[PDB]
Each structure stands twice: as structure tokens, then as C-alpha cells.
Amino acid sequence: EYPTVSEIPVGEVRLYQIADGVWSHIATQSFDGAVYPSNGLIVRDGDELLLIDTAWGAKNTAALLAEIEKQIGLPVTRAVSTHFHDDRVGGVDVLRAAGVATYASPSTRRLAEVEGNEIPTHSLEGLSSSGDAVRFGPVELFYPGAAHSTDNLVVYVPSASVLYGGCAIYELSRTSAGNVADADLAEWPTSIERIQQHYPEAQFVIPGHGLPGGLDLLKHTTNVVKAHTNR
Ligand SMILES: O=C(O)/C(S)=C/c1c(Cl)ccc(Cl)c1Cl
Ligand SMILES: [Zn+2]
Ligand SMILES: [Zn+2]
Ligand SMILES: [Zn+2]
């Protein structure tokens, strides 16, 4: 029942309700002749919504906002991008234009800038050291250490025990490393272990791309990362 690529045309965005007040948003993008899914999150915060990550580009992100207004009908007042790649910040200018306050760690902002990507307006403090956590509205933000990228954040929704790993976490069907040009292969397994230590009670784990599962996705990612390491 969780949507896959074949069900989502590029341009279109799906919402999937995970818990009371918790959805993922799912979009697709075609790159080098293949089509990829990508996840983000939506958390209700009173009469407003917190958005985690864009839907990978301006077009998809504009469709995400229309889809949220149509299906949920509460305003997106804030957005956090969990790292500096285009699937996380591509569409930030659309959010900003719609009056959404956009946020990211200083480190994510600097890396976006260097990459020439869109740049969240606000800087998130308290997340500079591995193991650091801060509360941001209805979620906890966690910096596990470098993994898929040096800046990657993970997000936890304590009310629903939902752990959103972003692109630091692989789905189960993904058995080979994705793009790791910006990865810290050496630290990645250690960073995943910090996630496991901090959220042992997580009941749903969302990867940046593909199908959700349970905490097994953490060991799965380490397995893939270590395999790639020994290539
Ligand atoms: O494997 C992943 O989760 C991602 S984010 C791959 C990637 C990278 Cl490394 C750079 C740029 C872009 Cl656009 C993408 Cl999609
Ligand atoms: Zn990435
Ligand atoms: Zn990604
Ligand atoms: Zn596995």
C-alpha cells in the first residue's frame, strides 16, 4: 500500500499517512534515464504543519504544497532540509516564496551554497557535534555524524515513534551503495549505531528513498556500506 515508482508520475506527489498527524510525501525524479522515488515527512504541529525535506525540485515541491492543501488543508509554516543535496533542498525557493520558513544546519547551508543548490534561510543551532539533538516543534532533530553526507540529519517523531533516517538510511531492496561522492564511508556505520542507540524504540523507519520498515533498515545500511567499503 506504500506507493512505488510505477504508481507516481514525475511531476506528481503522494502523501502516505503513517500515524496520527504523521505522513510521508513521495515523489519521483528521472535521472540519467532511470526513475527514482524519494521520501520526505510531514508532521502536524497544532493547527500547522512541519515539513521535512522538499519533493526533489521546484515542480515537485509546488505539487507537494498543492497536494498538502488539498488533502490536509493545514498551512506549512516551517520546513527542515536534512542534507544539502537537491532531493532535500531542491524546491526550497518555492517553499520560501509561499511563505514557508526554511531551516537547515549551518553545515548543510554551507554545502548547499558551495554546490550551487538552493539554500534554506534559517540556520539550526545545537547540531554541530555527533550525537547532538535538539527539539524543533513536534520532532527531535539528531545529528548522528557523517554518513551519506557530512551534514546529514535524522528526525524522530516521539508521539508516533517514527524515525525518519533520510538518505543516511537505505531501503531493504537497495543492496548496493547509491551515490557516495559526498559520503564518509568510514564513519557511516558508527553514525548509524548512534541512531540505533538514541532511538531503540522506533517502530517505523523511513529511508530517504524507497519503502519504510523497522529498525532492521539500520543494520541493512551498515551491511551495504561495509560491502561497498570492501569493493
Ligand atoms: O542516494 C541518495 O539518497 C542521494 S540524495 C543521491 C544524490 C547525491 Cl549523492 C547527490 C545529488 C543528488 Cl540529486 C542525489 Cl539524488
Ligand atoms: Zn544525498
Ligand atoms: Zn537522497
Ligand atoms: Zn539487508
Side-chain angles (χ1 to χ4, degrees), residues 2-5 8-11 13-15 25-29 35-40 54-56 60-61 64 208-209:
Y2 197 86
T4 74
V5 162
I8 307 178
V10 179
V13 177
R14 300 286 109 83
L15 313 185
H25 58 86
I26 312 91
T28 51
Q29 199 50 273
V35 184
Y36 298 88
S38 182
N39 300 312
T54 65
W56 201 348
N60 286 346
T61 299
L64 162 72
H209 310 267

PDB file of all heavy atoms in Angstrom, residues 2-5 8-15 25-29 35-40 54-56 60-61 64 208-209, unseen atoms left out:
ATOM      1  N   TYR A   2       2.140   1.188   0.406  1.00  0.00           N
ATOM      2  CA  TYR A   2       3.068   2.329   0.251  1.00  0.00           C
ATOM      3  C   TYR A   2       3.393   2.489  -1.229  1.00  0.00           C
ATOM      4  O   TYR A   2       3.787   1.520  -1.871  1.00  0.00           O
ATOM      5  CB  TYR A   2       4.372   2.118   1.045  1.00  0.00           C
ATOM      6  CG  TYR A   2       5.173   3.382   1.265  1.00  0.00           C
ATOM      7  CD1 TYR A   2       4.896   4.207   2.341  1.00  0.00           C
ATOM      8  CD2 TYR A   2       6.175   3.764   0.397  1.00  0.00           C
ATOM      9  CE1 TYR A   2       5.609   5.362   2.564  1.00  0.00           C
ATOM     10  CE2 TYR A   2       6.895   4.943   0.612  1.00  0.00           C
ATOM     11  CZ  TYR A   2       6.593   5.732   1.704  1.00  0.00           C
ATOM     12  OH  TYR A   2       7.301   6.896   1.956  1.00  0.00           O
ATOM     13  N   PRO A   3       3.229   3.695  -1.786  1.00  0.00           N
ATOM     14  CA  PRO A   3       3.437   3.849  -3.233  1.00  0.00           C
ATOM     15  C   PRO A   3       4.887   3.625  -3.683  1.00  0.00           C
ATOM     16  O   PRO A   3       5.822   4.000  -2.966  1.00  0.00           O
ATOM     17  CB  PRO A   3       3.018   5.308  -3.498  1.00  0.00           C
ATOM     18  CG  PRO A   3       3.151   5.992  -2.207  1.00  0.00           C
ATOM     19  CD  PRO A   3       2.863   4.966  -1.143  1.00  0.00           C
ATOM     20  N   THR A   4       5.037   3.024  -4.867  1.00  0.00           N
ATOM     21  CA  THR A   4       6.326   2.783  -5.525  1.00  0.00           C
ATOM     22  C   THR A   4       6.432   3.707  -6.729  1.00  0.00           C
ATOM     23  O   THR A   4       5.509   4.477  -6.992  1.00  0.00           O
ATOM     24  CB  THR A   4       6.471   1.321  -6.018  1.00  0.00           C
ATOM     25  OG1 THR A   4       5.656   1.123  -7.182  1.00  0.00           O
ATOM     26  CG2 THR A   4       6.049   0.327  -4.950  1.00  0.00           C
ATOM     27  N   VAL A   5       7.527   3.603  -7.484  1.00  0.00           N
ATOM     28  CA  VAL A   5       7.747   4.476  -8.645  1.00  0.00           C
ATOM     29  C   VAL A   5       6.673   4.340  -9.723  1.00  0.00           C
ATOM     30  O   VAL A   5       6.193   5.348 -10.250  1.00  0.00           O
ATOM     31  CB  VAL A   5       9.121   4.204  -9.296  1.00  0.00           C
ATOM     32  CG1 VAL A   5       9.189   4.772 -10.725  1.00  0.00           C
ATOM     33  CG2 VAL A   5      10.232   4.802  -8.456  1.00  0.00           C
ATOM     34  N   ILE A   8       3.756   6.567  -9.321  1.00  0.00           N
ATOM     35  CA  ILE A   8       3.941   8.018  -9.228  1.00  0.00           C
ATOM     36  C   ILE A   8       4.606   8.607 -10.470  1.00  0.00           C
ATOM     37  O   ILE A   8       5.818   8.464 -10.652  1.00  0.00           O
ATOM     38  CB  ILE A   8       4.798   8.419  -8.007  1.00  0.00           C
ATOM     39  CG1 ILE A   8       4.221   7.816  -6.734  1.00  0.00           C
ATOM     40  CG2 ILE A   8       4.844   9.939  -7.881  1.00  0.00           C
ATOM     41  CD1 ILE A   8       5.033   8.108  -5.487  1.00  0.00           C
ATOM     42  N   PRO A   9       3.825   9.297 -11.315  1.00  0.00           N
ATOM     43  CA  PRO A   9       4.453  10.027 -12.419  1.00  0.00           C
ATOM     44  C   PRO A   9       5.298  11.202 -11.930  1.00  0.00           C
ATOM     45  O   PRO A   9       4.886  11.917 -11.006  1.00  0.00           O
ATOM     46  CB  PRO A   9       3.259  10.520 -13.242  1.00  0.00           C
ATOM     47  CG  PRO A   9       2.100  10.495 -12.305  1.00  0.00           C
ATOM     48  CD  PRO A   9       2.354   9.376 -11.358  1.00  0.00           C
ATOM     49  N   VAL A  10       6.472  11.388 -12.531  1.00  0.00           N
ATOM     50  CA  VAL A  10       7.283  12.555 -12.225  1.00  0.00           C
ATOM     51  C   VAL A  10       6.404  13.772 -12.486  1.00  0.00           C
ATOM     52  O   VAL A  10       5.703  13.837 -13.503  1.00  0.00           O
ATOM     53  CB  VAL A  10       8.592  12.625 -13.062  1.00  0.00           C
ATOM     54  CG1 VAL A  10       9.385  13.881 -12.718  1.00  0.00           C
ATOM     55  CG2 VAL A  10       9.456  11.405 -12.818  1.00  0.00           C
ATOM     56  N   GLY A  11       6.430  14.717 -11.547  1.00  0.00           N
ATOM     57  CA  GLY A  11       5.511  15.839 -11.549  1.00  0.00           C
ATOM     58  C   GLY A  11       4.509  15.698 -10.422  1.00  0.00           C
ATOM     59  O   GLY A  11       4.164  16.692  -9.788  1.00  0.00           O
ATOM     60  N   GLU A  12       4.062  14.463 -10.166  1.00  0.00           N
ATOM     61  CA  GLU A  12       3.036  14.179  -9.163  1.00  0.00           C
ATOM     62  C   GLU A  12       3.641  13.797  -7.807  1.00  0.00           C
ATOM     63  O   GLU A  12       4.755  13.274  -7.739  1.00  0.00           O
ATOM     64  CB  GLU A  12       2.119  13.054  -9.648  1.00  0.00           C
ATOM     65  N   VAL A  13       2.885  14.045  -6.738  1.00  0.00           N
ATOM     66  CA  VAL A  13       3.312  13.731  -5.379  1.00  0.00           C
ATOM     67  C   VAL A  13       2.199  13.044  -4.588  1.00  0.00           C
ATOM     68  O   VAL A  13       1.050  13.480  -4.608  1.00  0.00           O
ATOM     69  CB  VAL A  13       3.751  14.988  -4.610  1.00  0.00           C
ATOM     70  CG1 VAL A  13       4.117  14.638  -3.160  1.00  0.00           C
ATOM     71  CG2 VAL A  13       4.928  15.651  -5.290  1.00  0.00           C
ATOM     72  N   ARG A  14       2.565  11.979  -3.884  1.00  0.00           N
ATOM     73  CA  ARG A  14       1.658  11.241  -2.999  1.00  0.00           C
ATOM     74  C   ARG A  14       1.970  11.507  -1.529  1.00  0.00           C
ATOM     75  O   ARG A  14       3.128  11.677  -1.142  1.00  0.00           O
ATOM     76  CB  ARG A  14       1.749   9.719  -3.241  1.00  0.00           C
ATOM     77  CG  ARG A  14       1.414   9.223  -4.639  1.00  0.00           C
ATOM     78  CD  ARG A  14      -0.067   9.260  -4.930  1.00  0.00           C
ATOM     79  NE  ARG A  14      -0.380  10.322  -5.891  1.00  0.00           N
ATOM     80  CZ  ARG A  14      -0.264  10.207  -7.215  1.00  0.00           C
ATOM     81  NH1 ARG A  14       0.157   9.071  -7.768  1.00  0.00           N
ATOM     82  NH2 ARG A  14      -0.572  11.238  -7.990  1.00  0.00           N
ATOM     83  N   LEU A  15       0.923  11.513  -0.714  1.00  0.00           N
ATOM     84  CA  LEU A  15       1.066  11.533   0.727  1.00  0.00           C
ATOM     85  C   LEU A  15       0.659  10.179   1.250  1.00  0.00           C
ATOM     86  O   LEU A  15      -0.313   9.586   0.770  1.00  0.00           O
ATOM     87  CB  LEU A  15       0.196  12.613   1.367  1.00  0.00           C
ATOM     88  CG  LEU A  15       0.257  13.995   0.724  1.00  0.00           C
ATOM     89  CD1 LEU A  15      -0.545  14.947   1.538  1.00  0.00           C
ATOM     90  CD2 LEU A  15       1.670  14.476   0.589  1.00  0.00           C
ATOM     91  N   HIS A  25       5.729  12.158   2.334  1.00  0.00           N
ATOM     92  CA  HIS A  25       5.359  12.563   0.989  1.00  0.00           C
ATOM     93  C   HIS A  25       6.314  11.820   0.062  1.00  0.00           C
ATOM     94  O   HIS A  25       7.455  11.595   0.412  1.00  0.00           O
ATOM     95  CB  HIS A  25       5.379  14.098   0.787  1.00  0.00           C
ATOM     96  CG  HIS A  25       6.694  14.773   1.058  1.00  0.00           C
ATOM     97  ND1 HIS A  25       7.689  14.899   0.109  1.00  0.00           N
ATOM     98  CD2 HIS A  25       7.142  15.432   2.154  1.00  0.00           C
ATOM     99  CE1 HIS A  25       8.694  15.581   0.609  1.00  0.00           C
ATOM    100  NE2 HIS A  25       8.388  15.919   1.851  1.00  0.00           N
ATOM    101  N   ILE A  26       5.800  11.373  -1.075  1.00  0.00           N
ATOM    102  CA  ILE A  26       6.572  10.578  -2.028  1.00  0.00           C
ATOM    103  C   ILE A  26       6.481  11.218  -3.400  1.00  0.00           C
ATOM    104  O   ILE A  26       5.399  11.598  -3.865  1.00  0.00           O
ATOM    105  CB  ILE A  26       6.075   9.111  -2.114  1.00  0.00           C
ATOM    106  CG1 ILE A  26       5.911   8.511  -0.712  1.00  0.00           C
ATOM    107  CG2 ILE A  26       7.038   8.242  -2.959  1.00  0.00           C
ATOM    108  CD1 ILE A  26       4.532   8.686  -0.105  1.00  0.00           C
ATOM    109  N   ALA A  27       7.642  11.372  -4.020  1.00  0.00           N
ATOM    110  CA  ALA A  27       7.745  11.955  -5.340  1.00  0.00           C
ATOM    111  C   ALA A  27       8.751  11.152  -6.131  1.00  0.00           C
ATOM    112  O   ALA A  27       9.352  10.233  -5.605  1.00  0.00           O
ATOM    113  CB  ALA A  27       8.149  13.391  -5.250  1.00  0.00           C
ATOM    114  N   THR A  28       8.909  11.484  -7.401  1.00  0.00           N
ATOM    115  CA  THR A  28       9.828  10.764  -8.265  1.00  0.00           C
ATOM    116  C   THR A  28      10.615  11.745  -9.119  1.00  0.00           C
ATOM    117  O   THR A  28      10.190  12.868  -9.377  1.00  0.00           O
ATOM    118  CB  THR A  28       9.094   9.739  -9.189  1.00  0.00           C
ATOM    119  OG1 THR A  28       8.023  10.379  -9.879  1.00  0.00           O
ATOM    120  CG2 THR A  28       8.542   8.557  -8.385  1.00  0.00           C
ATOM    121  N   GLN A  29      11.775  11.297  -9.557  1.00  0.00           N
ATOM    122  CA  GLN A  29      12.597  12.090 -10.432  1.00  0.00           C
ATOM    123  C   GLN A  29      13.330  11.148 -11.377  1.00  0.00           C
ATOM    124  O   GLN A  29      13.747  10.049 -10.986  1.00  0.00           O
ATOM    125  CB  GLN A  29      13.574  12.944  -9.613  1.00  0.00           C
ATOM    126  CG  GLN A  29      14.174  14.110 -10.339  1.00  0.00           C
ATOM    127  CD  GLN A  29      13.133  14.969 -11.030  1.00  0.00           C
ATOM    128  OE1 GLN A  29      12.757  14.693 -12.162  1.00  0.00           O
ATOM    129  NE2 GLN A  29      12.662  16.008 -10.349  1.00  0.00           N
ATOM    130  N   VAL A  35      14.294   6.203 -13.250  1.00  0.00           N
ATOM    131  CA  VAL A  35      13.400   6.955 -12.376  1.00  0.00           C
ATOM    132  C   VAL A  35      13.526   6.483 -10.944  1.00  0.00           C
ATOM    133  O   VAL A  35      13.481   5.277 -10.666  1.00  0.00           O
ATOM    134  CB  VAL A  35      11.937   6.836 -12.806  1.00  0.00           C
ATOM    135  CG1 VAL A  35      11.065   7.712 -11.914  1.00  0.00           C
ATOM    136  CG2 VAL A  35      11.777   7.240 -14.274  1.00  0.00           C
ATOM    137  N   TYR A  36      13.654   7.454 -10.041  1.00  0.00           N
ATOM    138  CA  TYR A  36      13.908   7.192  -8.635  1.00  0.00           C
ATOM    139  C   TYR A  36      12.777   7.748  -7.787  1.00  0.00           C
ATOM    140  O   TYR A  36      12.289   8.823  -8.079  1.00  0.00           O
ATOM    141  CB  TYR A  36      15.217   7.844  -8.216  1.00  0.00           C
ATOM    142  CG  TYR A  36      16.404   7.302  -8.970  1.00  0.00           C
ATOM    143  CD1 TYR A  36      16.791   7.860 -10.185  1.00  0.00           C
ATOM    144  CD2 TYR A  36      17.136   6.219  -8.470  1.00  0.00           C
ATOM    145  CE1 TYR A  36      17.867   7.363 -10.882  1.00  0.00           C
ATOM    146  CE2 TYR A  36      18.218   5.720  -9.164  1.00  0.00           C
ATOM    147  CZ  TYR A  36      18.568   6.296 -10.369  1.00  0.00           C
ATOM    148  OH  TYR A  36      19.631   5.795 -11.064  1.00  0.00           O
ATOM    149  N   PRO A  37      12.386   7.035  -6.720  1.00  0.00           N
ATOM    150  CA  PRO A  37      11.481   7.607  -5.733  1.00  0.00           C
ATOM    151  C   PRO A  37      12.262   8.399  -4.694  1.00  0.00           C
ATOM    152  O   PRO A  37      13.477   8.230  -4.562  1.00  0.00           O
ATOM    153  CB  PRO A  37      10.826   6.368  -5.117  1.00  0.00           C
ATOM    154  CG  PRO A  37      11.876   5.351  -5.140  1.00  0.00           C
ATOM    155  CD  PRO A  37      12.782   5.668  -6.336  1.00  0.00           C
ATOM    156  N   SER A  38      11.573   9.254  -3.953  1.00  0.00           N
ATOM    157  CA  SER A  38      12.207   9.975  -2.885  1.00  0.00           C
ATOM    158  C   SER A  38      11.152  10.306  -1.856  1.00  0.00           C
ATOM    159  O   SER A  38      10.020  10.698  -2.223  1.00  0.00           O
ATOM    160  CB  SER A  38      12.878  11.241  -3.394  1.00  0.00           C
ATOM    161  OG  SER A  38      13.514  11.881  -2.303  1.00  0.00           O
ATOM    162  N   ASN A  39      11.516  10.143  -0.589  1.00  0.00           N
ATOM    163  CA  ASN A  39      10.626  10.430   0.537  1.00  0.00           C
ATOM    164  C   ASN A  39      10.970  11.721   1.281  1.00  0.00           C
ATOM    165  O   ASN A  39      12.136  12.124   1.360  1.00  0.00           O
ATOM    166  CB  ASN A  39      10.657   9.296   1.569  1.00  0.00           C
ATOM    167  CG  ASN A  39      10.218   7.954   1.006  1.00  0.00           C
ATOM    168  OD1 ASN A  39       9.181   7.825   0.336  1.00  0.00           O
ATOM    169  ND2 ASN A  39      11.032   6.940   1.259  1.00  0.00           N
ATOM    170  N   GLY A  40       9.936  12.347   1.836  1.00  0.00           N
ATOM    171  CA  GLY A  40      10.084  13.325   2.887  1.00  0.00           C
ATOM    172  C   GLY A  40       9.006  13.080   3.934  1.00  0.00           C
ATOM    173  O   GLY A  40       8.265  12.083   3.861  1.00  0.00           O
ATOM    174  N   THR A  54      12.185  18.809   0.812  1.00  0.00           N
ATOM    175  CA  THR A  54      11.432  19.118  -0.390  1.00  0.00           C
ATOM    176  C   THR A  54      11.086  17.817  -1.108  1.00  0.00           C
ATOM    177  O   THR A  54      11.569  16.764  -0.707  1.00  0.00           O
ATOM    178  CB  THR A  54      12.238  19.976  -1.345  1.00  0.00           C
ATOM    179  OG1 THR A  54      13.355  19.213  -1.803  1.00  0.00           O
ATOM    180  CG2 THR A  54      12.729  21.243  -0.681  1.00  0.00           C
ATOM    181  N   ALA A  55      10.292  17.908  -2.183  1.00  0.00           N
ATOM    182  CA  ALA A  55       9.983  16.741  -3.009  1.00  0.00           C
ATOM    183  C   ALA A  55      10.877  16.671  -4.265  1.00  0.00           C
ATOM    184  O   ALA A  55      10.445  16.228  -5.313  1.00  0.00           O
ATOM    185  CB  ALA A  55       8.515  16.750  -3.407  1.00  0.00           C
ATOM    186  N   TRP A  56      12.120  17.119  -4.134  1.00  0.00           N
ATOM    187  CA  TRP A  56      13.133  16.992  -5.187  1.00  0.00           C
ATOM    188  C   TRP A  56      12.835  17.855  -6.426  1.00  0.00           C
ATOM    189  O   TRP A  56      12.497  17.348  -7.495  1.00  0.00           O
ATOM    190  CB  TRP A  56      13.274  15.515  -5.593  1.00  0.00           C
ATOM    191  CG  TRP A  56      14.547  15.150  -6.255  1.00  0.00           C
ATOM    192  CD1 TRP A  56      15.514  16.002  -6.761  1.00  0.00           C
ATOM    193  CD2 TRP A  56      15.028  13.822  -6.491  1.00  0.00           C
ATOM    194  NE1 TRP A  56      16.546  15.272  -7.296  1.00  0.00           N
ATOM    195  CE2 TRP A  56      16.278  13.934  -7.135  1.00  0.00           C
ATOM    196  CE3 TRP A  56      14.519  12.544  -6.221  1.00  0.00           C
ATOM    197  CZ2 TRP A  56      17.026  12.819  -7.504  1.00  0.00           C
ATOM    198  CZ3 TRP A  56      15.258  11.440  -6.591  1.00  0.00           C
ATOM    199  CH2 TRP A  56      16.502  11.582  -7.225  1.00  0.00           C
ATOM    200  N   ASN A  60       8.059  19.475  -8.402  1.00  0.00           N
ATOM    201  CA  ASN A  60       7.503  18.504  -7.455  1.00  0.00           C
ATOM    202  C   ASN A  60       7.097  19.165  -6.151  1.00  0.00           C
ATOM    203  O   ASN A  60       6.115  18.790  -5.530  1.00  0.00           O
ATOM    204  CB  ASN A  60       8.499  17.385  -7.120  1.00  0.00           C
ATOM    205  CG  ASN A  60       8.687  16.352  -8.250  1.00  0.00           C
ATOM    206  OD1 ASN A  60       7.916  16.261  -9.221  1.00  0.00           O
ATOM    207  ND2 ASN A  60       9.725  15.557  -8.101  1.00  0.00           N
ATOM    208  N   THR A  61       7.895  20.124  -5.708  1.00  0.00           N
ATOM    209  CA  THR A  61       7.643  20.805  -4.451  1.00  0.00           C
ATOM    210  C   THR A  61       6.372  21.664  -4.557  1.00  0.00           C
ATOM    211  O   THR A  61       5.562  21.697  -3.627  1.00  0.00           O
ATOM    212  CB  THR A  61       8.863  21.646  -4.047  1.00  0.00           C
ATOM    213  OG1 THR A  61       9.987  20.771  -3.876  1.00  0.00           O
ATOM    214  CG2 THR A  61       8.626  22.397  -2.742  1.00  0.00           C
ATOM    215  N   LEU A  64       3.722  19.236  -4.223  1.00  0.00           N
ATOM    216  CA  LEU A  64       3.615  18.841  -2.831  1.00  0.00           C
ATOM    217  C   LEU A  64       2.748  19.833  -2.063  1.00  0.00           C
ATOM    218  O   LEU A  64       1.856  19.443  -1.329  1.00  0.00           O
ATOM    219  CB  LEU A  64       5.015  18.729  -2.196  1.00  0.00           C
ATOM    220  CG  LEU A  64       5.084  18.733  -0.671  1.00  0.00           C
ATOM    221  CD1 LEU A  64       4.551  17.421  -0.076  1.00  0.00           C
ATOM    222  CD2 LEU A  64       6.542  19.021  -0.238  1.00  0.00           C
ATOM    223  N   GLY A 208      15.503   7.711   2.936  1.00  0.00           N
ATOM    224  CA  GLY A 208      15.358   8.840   2.032  1.00  0.00           C
ATOM    225  C   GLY A 208      14.670   8.427   0.740  1.00  0.00           C
ATOM    226  O   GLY A 208      13.888   9.194   0.160  1.00  0.00           O
ATOM    227  N   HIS A 209      14.952   7.204   0.299  1.00  0.00           N
ATOM    228  CA  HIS A 209      14.378   6.657  -0.930  1.00  0.00           C
ATOM    229  C   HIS A 209      13.843   5.253  -0.715  1.00  0.00           C
ATOM    230  O   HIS A 209      14.560   4.375  -0.223  1.00  0.00           O
ATOM    231  CB  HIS A 209      15.414   6.648  -2.047  1.00  0.00           C
ATOM    232  CG  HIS A 209      16.103   7.954  -2.218  1.00  0.00           C
ATOM    233  ND1 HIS A 209      15.675   8.912  -3.111  1.00  0.00           N
ATOM    234  CD2 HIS A 209      17.144   8.500  -1.546  1.00  0.00           C
ATOM    235  CE1 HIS A 209      16.447   9.978  -3.004  1.00  0.00           C
ATOM    236  NE2 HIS A 209      17.344   9.756  -2.061  1.00  0.00           N
TER     237      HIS A 209
END
